[PDB]
């Protein structure tokens, strides 16, 4: 990996411990999530899309992945790699899980933190100012909760 792709992986990475021991704000803790592997088809694919420096484009051939069944993606336009996945993280502001809904957007915080997705792969290109950053999940999220709960006495 390289030195931003090892940092976006850490992050995710740490977000996914934090939920589960009560360290994201105002958010449930997660029961169970399944421990992200880094996979280099979708981190490849990640990358060819970033390259085209394109932030909508979307374009459905880039959620057709080897075999997954199913894609998720988040994008960010930013002119650095840890602001693009604080902003992500901090989505969780605008989530209320018990409603399962969504004041603004929730969808990248919910992607980071989404219980049965097991592979990740991210690519980014410089694109002038800002990095174009891609991050390919599989399987990606639906629309449902991204987790089951727990007592928070288990943190
Ligand atoms: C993930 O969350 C769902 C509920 O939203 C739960 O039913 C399912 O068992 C969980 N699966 C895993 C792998 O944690």
């Known amino acids: ?59 459905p051939n880039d959620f057709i992945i ?6 998720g993606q988040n994008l960010a336009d930013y002119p650095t790699i840890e602001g693009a996945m604080k902003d992500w993280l901090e989505e969780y502001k605008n989530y209320n899980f018990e409603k399962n809904q969504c004041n603004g957007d929730c969808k990248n915080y919910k992607q980071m933190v989404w219980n049965t997705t097991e592979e990740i792969g991210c690519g980014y290109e410089k694109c002038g100012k800002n990095y174009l950053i891609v991050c390919n999940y599989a399987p990606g999220d639906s629309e449902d909760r991204p987790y089951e709960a727990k007592p928070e006495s288990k943190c």
């Open 1 to 59: 990996l390289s030195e931003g792709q090892r940092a976006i992986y850490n992050f995710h990475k740490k977000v996914r411990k934090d939920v589960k021991n009560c360290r994201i704000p105002g958010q449930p803790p997660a029961k169970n999530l399944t421990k992200l592997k880094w996979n280099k088809l979708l981190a490849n694919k990640a990358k060819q899309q970033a390259k085209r420096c394109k932030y909508d484009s979307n374009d």
């Open 66 to 71: 080897g075999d997954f069944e199913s894609i």
